[PDB]
Amino acid sequence: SQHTCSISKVTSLLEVNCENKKLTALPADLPADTGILHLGENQLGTFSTASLVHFTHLTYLYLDRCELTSLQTNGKLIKLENLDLSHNNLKSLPSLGWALPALTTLDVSFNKLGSLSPGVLDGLSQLQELYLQNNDLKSLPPGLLLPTTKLKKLNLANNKLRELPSGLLDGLEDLDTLYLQRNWLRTIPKGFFGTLLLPFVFLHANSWYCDCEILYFRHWLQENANNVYLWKQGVDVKDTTPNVASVRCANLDNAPVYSYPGKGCP
């Protein structure tokens, strides 16, 4: 029948699926009570949140695979909890927190982000999950995660990170999963993990340099052998065994960092 999108409602939210419909623009005739909007596999190019301010039930918004080159956060989406911008061409992000106060899940994976601005996450006090994997990030700003105290999952894998801010994780007591595999990391700064307990941490495929400055990390690794994992496609970390040996000294023929003797270190 005639509406381009498929409209249904299995949960408490009216669900509108406009995926893969050769769209160039947002539909003009979306239902007023749209709660979940699927817009993936279209050719939107750009997206401004001002276009959805009048859908007062909108809670899930999927803009994945939309050819996006930019995002404007000029309209406030009061109820939005889940925003998916993955598999697009974003090179920068605007400030998100004024527009997206209720957000709990942000996915900006598979984009081309080269950096993040200082207060991009300011005001996202409810954020629980942040997916940034498969971008071009070279460093992260100081205080990035200070607005997001309830963060539970952080995925920074498959970027170009050269170093990490010393205080990146400070105070993130609910953080349970951390993915840093596939970066250009050579060391971990003293105090990086604090007294945080992180049951699922992935640190492999970096180029750790084993010398006297890797000793904070070696100790942490020994103490958290039970919490370091090898990422395995399509398999939930809960069905995998820990593998502390996955973390290796690139300058010592990939011998594991956990067993690095530190010979002749003060």
Side-chain angles (χ1 to χ4, degrees), residues 175-190:
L175 189 68
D176 70 56
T177 303
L178 172 65
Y179 298 88
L180 282 166
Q181 77 277 14
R182 305 265 159 211
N183 276 292
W184 297 348
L185 291 172
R186 291 165 47 84
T187 193
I188 291 296
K190 194 183 192 188

Side-chain angles (χ1 to χ4, degrees), residues 136-205:
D136 301 312
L137 294 164
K138 298 205 145 144
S139 70
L140 298 170
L144 174 69
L145 301 178
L146 188 143
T148 62
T149 71
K150 313 291 198 199
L151 206 71
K152 296 171 135 292
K153 313 264 182 265
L154 171 62
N155 189 343
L156 287 163
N158 283 265
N159 274 288
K160 306 193 209 294
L161 297 172
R162 297 181 163 151
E163 45 178 45
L164 300 168
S166 197
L168 183 75
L169 310 176
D170 286 5
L172 299 181
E173 281 289 353
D174 294 341
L175 189 68
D176 70 56
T177 303
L178 172 65
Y179 298 88
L180 282 166
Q181 77 277 14
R182 305 265 159 211
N183 276 292
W184 297 348
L185 291 172
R186 291 165 47 84
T187 193
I188 291 296
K190 194 183 192 188
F192 177 79
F193 300 100
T195 49
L196 303 176
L197 170 48
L198 304 179
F200 307 107
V201 188
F202 303 79
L203 289 153
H204 60 91

Side-chain angles (χ1 to χ4, degrees), residues 33-223:
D33 290 333
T34 303
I36 299 164
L37 182 62
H38 306 71
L39 283 164
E41 324 193 308
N42 286 121
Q43 302 75 46
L44 297 182
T46 181
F47 185 75
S48 166
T49 60
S51 52
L52 297 179
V53 298
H54 292 304
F55 299 99
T56 60
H57 295 88
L58 179 70
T59 312
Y60 299 77
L61 176 59
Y62 310 132
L63 295 163
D64 60 297
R65 288 149 270 244
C66 278
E67 301 183 349
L68 266 13
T69 53
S70 66
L71 171 67
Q72 290 78 61
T73 48
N74 57 346
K76 181 182 305 205
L77 309 176
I78 297 160
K79 286 191 222 271
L80 193 76
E81 297 171 25
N82 185 310
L83 175 61
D84 188 355
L85 303 168
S86 62
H87 295 274
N88 278 296
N89 307 278
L90 298 162
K91 287 195 69 175
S92 64
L93 285 180
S95 292
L96 298 174
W98 172 79
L100 306 176
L103 207 70
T104 63
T105 307
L106 182 60
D107 194 335
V108 201
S109 62
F110 294 94
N111 273 273
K112 304 183 201 296
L113 302 174
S115 67
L116 296 168
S117 306
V120 62
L121 310 184
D122 281 6
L124 293 176
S125 75
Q126 312 300 299
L127 207 71
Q128 287 175 36
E129 307 181 25
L130 181 52
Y131 300 99
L132 291 167
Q133 69 275 21
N134 290 268
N135 277 285
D136 301 312
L137 294 164
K138 298 205 145 144
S139 70
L140 298 170
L144 174 69
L145 301 178
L146 188 143
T148 62
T149 71
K150 313 291 198 199
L151 206 71
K152 296 171 135 292
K153 313 264 182 265
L154 171 62
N155 189 343
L156 287 163
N158 283 265
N159 274 288
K160 306 193 209 294
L161 297 172
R162 297 181 163 151
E163 45 178 45
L164 300 168
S166 197
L168 183 75
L169 310 176
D170 286 5
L172 299 181
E173 281 289 353
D174 294 341
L175 189 68
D176 70 56
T177 303
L178 172 65
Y179 298 88
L180 282 166
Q181 77 277 14
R182 305 265 159 211
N183 276 292
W184 297 348
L185 291 172
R186 291 165 47 84
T187 193
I188 291 296
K190 194 183 192 188
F192 177 79
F193 300 100
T195 49
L196 303 176
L197 170 48
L198 304 179
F200 307 107
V201 188
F202 303 79
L203 289 153
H204 60 91
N206 271 291
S207 33
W208 305 108
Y209 194 84
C210 292
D211 68 4
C212 304
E213 305 313 301
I214 209 65
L215 295 191
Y216 166 78
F217 190 27
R218 179 189 67 181
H219 185 58
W220 185 92
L221 284 159
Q222 281 163 11
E223 290 300 303

Side-chain angles (χ1 to χ4, degrees), residues 238-257:
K238 87 184 198 190
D239 303 317
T240 64
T241 304
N243 198 334
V244 74
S246 63
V247 186
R248 300 175 179 182
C249 304
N251 62 317
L252 301 169
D253 193 37
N254 288 323
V257 175

